[PDB]
Curated annotation (Swiss-Prot), chains A, B:
Record has rRNA-binding as a keyword: no
Principal subcellular localisation of the protein: cytoplasm
Keywords: Aminotransferase, Cytoplasm, Pyridoxal phosphate, Transferase
Gene induction: Transcription is increased specifically in response to 2,4,6-trinitrotoluene (TNT) and its indicator compounds 1,3-DNB, 2,4-DNT, and 2,6-DNT.
GO molecular function annotation: identical protein binding; L-aspartate:2-oxoglutarate aminotransferase activity; L-tyrosine-2-oxoglutarate transaminase activity; protein homodimerization activity; pyridoxal phosphate binding
Catalytic reaction(s) noted: L-aspartate + 2-oxoglutarate = oxaloacetate + L-glutamate
Organism from which the protein derives: Escherichia coli (strain K12)
Protein known as: Aspartate aminotransferase
Phenotype for residue 133 to A: Slight increase in maximum velocity of the overall transamination reaction between aspartate and 2-oxoglutarate
Gene Ontology CC entries for this record: cytoplasm; cytosol
GO annotation, biological process: L-phenylalanine biosynthetic process; L-phenylalanine biosynthetic process from chorismate via phenylpyruvate
Cystine connections: none
InterPro entries in alphabetical order: Aminotransferase_I/II_large, Asp_trans, NHTrfase_class1_PyrdxlP-BS, PyrdxlP-dep_Trfase, PyrdxlP-dep_Trfase_major, PyrdxlP-dep_Trfase_small
Family: Belongs to the class-I pyridoxal-phosphate-dependent aminotransferase family.
Amino acid sequence: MFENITAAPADPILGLADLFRADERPGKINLGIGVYKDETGKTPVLTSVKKAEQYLLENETTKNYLGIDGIPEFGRCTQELLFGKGSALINDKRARTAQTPGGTGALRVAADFLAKNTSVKRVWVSNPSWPNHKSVFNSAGLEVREYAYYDAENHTLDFDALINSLNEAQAGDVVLFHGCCHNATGIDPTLEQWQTLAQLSVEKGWLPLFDFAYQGFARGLEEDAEGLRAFAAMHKELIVASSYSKNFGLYNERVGACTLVAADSETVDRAFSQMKAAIRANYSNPPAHGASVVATILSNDALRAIWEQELTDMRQRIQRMRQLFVNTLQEKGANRDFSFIIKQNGMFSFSGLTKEQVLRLREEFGVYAVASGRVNVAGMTPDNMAPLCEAIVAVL
Amino acid sequence: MFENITAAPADPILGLADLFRADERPGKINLGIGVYKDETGKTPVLTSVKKAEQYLLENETTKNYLGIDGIPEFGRCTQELLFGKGSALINDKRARTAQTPGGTGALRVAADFLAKNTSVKRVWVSNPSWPNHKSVFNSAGLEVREYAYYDAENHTLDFDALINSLNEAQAGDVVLFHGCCHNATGIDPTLEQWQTLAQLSVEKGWLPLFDFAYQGFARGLEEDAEGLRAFAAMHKELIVASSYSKNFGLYNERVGACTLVAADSETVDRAFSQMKAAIRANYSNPPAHGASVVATILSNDALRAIWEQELTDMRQRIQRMRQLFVNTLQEKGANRDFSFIIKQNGMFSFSGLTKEQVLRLREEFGVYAVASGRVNVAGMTPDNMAPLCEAIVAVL
């Protein structure tokens, strides 16, 4: 039965990793990573997390199944974080949240739900966009289309091309937006641009689906939610797939949420039931550990304080590296302007390097990056900055 | 978009739960539970688990993403437990294991994998069978058929009807078997019956898929694997969906595995790659906590000894309850013979009560059971045995 099965194509990231590892060179640098890294080059466990884990160890009395939608407190904390407390969406009980296995799991659940309970057939994603978006939706049997977003020439948001391409989308089609820290351009719309998209969206009958994996990485918790909040204030229906993998550094514990928004309580409840059905048919119920940790922290003033500070430290680390990277480039005798790097949010940005330059950097300098020229700034350190920039300069 | 969505049908178990809860009655007894419970009526955290969790707390330095297939050691320990150490399947590197979110998750992954990479279109499940089997497979777009198994009259395994019904199954069809502790008849095939099925299976060109969620609950770790092992010795290809939810009391941490078996290393590797692709499109990678705990215990002599003892205690509690139940029934002036209860393995069994009797038990006596007459013997205690039996007698 398996004789004729063809091998799945290989991810370049994972493939890049293996290549990096098997490299004897000393000054090797890996900018192809997908996670946060501190000044020492590691991905530690947050202090707030460790504290929460101790608490669970001492207080947990059972590992009995959680409800299909998971921990209640986790859901409420997640909603406040998304919509802010005092939000009408909350007071009007128009939103239901399901705890899921990471942000990816949330996306998959939404996809299965849409595919069997609605007339949705197409989903629009930006060009470019996180490559996993295609696989997830296609797996549910949904069609994936691309809208213009990034301007590889000016390294900016081509609002016009965006609005223009999205005009080809019909009512009842879903449009996917990155809440903040666009992956992997680092280019987000302005508040005014968000408001413009919201209006347009309502007018066109689109179903907005937000992929919110980096809340707190752009400007801050609240600031980063402005776009989403701009949409929520205008839509009756909405879907949010959030992740705590990065902002809580809980990558491997698979902590995320799928939030459903409807016109009213009755409707959302009825709709949520089918979402739960979709979950039951997938993994049954969610993993407690990771979510328990998030709920404990968010609901405890002390722990929350600590965590917010740790998050700030991460955000600032990145902002610092972006700035430092540009300065060092210029100092080292850089050809082109890289100042756009400073206007981009999050861990990712397109360096503008060519496929051949990337190949060269690796072969000749032990500097690792994705063939697209994508780099993870968290992979940079005050310590490796110089050698890094000198190598880049050598390939320009 | 969600205006016309119809509510999903409510599931009895969860419905039963709520009903039980909202019951003011004092002597209420819940036999409709789906998990193990101890003499005090609780589902505690295993001592071996707590120890393992302390160890992780103290030694974990990162929560970085696990590989798509999860923790390697988890995979190897799992394979040994399934096939026994020194197994040819292992030494020949014919099996690949993926860590999944519970047994259910393993089932779903197998389904998606089969649906997109093979010609499978139908899956045969026993009548009756865990109701969630249908949803999972249908969700992947697979057809589900039923084979005869249980004999409601003699409360036994109708081997003949079984063999007969399965003759309608064509080559390339998948046949699903419960490794041990059939849910929810508690009726398993004898070693000789297993061997007969194995021969027939090979002859007919079926693809066996084992659902192994209760290893260690019937006779013992190794004993309970006899059937599976009987099949493995005869097939080139096989699939096993195992769970640690019950035998490790790790229900909510979602710990399970999906094991793929092929004729050879090259084949299994090529096939596993597509399985990974299916995972990536679902939840991306698995939750670490639960699986870490399992791997820690299974690989440490001391911890493993403790755990095996805890498992034994669980198995024996159940055997004790089955025996006590039958005796108490007889003493209490029972009408019918219930001795079949003693020959059944695991937490579940069909009491043989009618739908109206079940309704009566609850309304009149506060005794809760599923409408199918299914009872969870782990819900019984030496303390509640008398009242329970007196109520049952009153409805015969």
